Structure 1
Amino acid sequence: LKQIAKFVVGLGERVSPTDIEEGMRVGVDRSKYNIELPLPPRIDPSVTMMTVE
């Protein structure tokens, strides 16, 4: 987690092991952490995202 606390999570039902990549940003459920949806990696574009013409 972004606040810093690691959890070992299971496998969602809208996802397969093939869609989950490593380093990939993922939504976890805030009710019980579990990967739900893979979400475009990198939170870093914001000064490389506003220089696309």
Structure 2
Amino acid sequence: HPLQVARCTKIIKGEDAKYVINLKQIAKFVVGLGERVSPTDIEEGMRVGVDRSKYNIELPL
């Protein structure tokens, strides 16, 4: 599934429920500090993933 930047355009909840990785200079989204244990998931939007460079987030889908 190629994604090298992954918007989900204001899916909003909240603790959490936005879970969006953007890797682009403009907008730095870090989901750091070790584990979030998930079955499959960051968040929704055809684009669960963790770009080409990973701000933690150990590799769903």
Q: Which has the higher strand share?
A: 1
Q: Same fold (TM over 0.5)?
A: no
Category of TM-score, reference length = shorter chain: under 0.3
**TM-score, with length taken from structure 2:** 0.23
**TM-score, with length taken from structure 1:** 0.25
Larger radius of gyration: 1
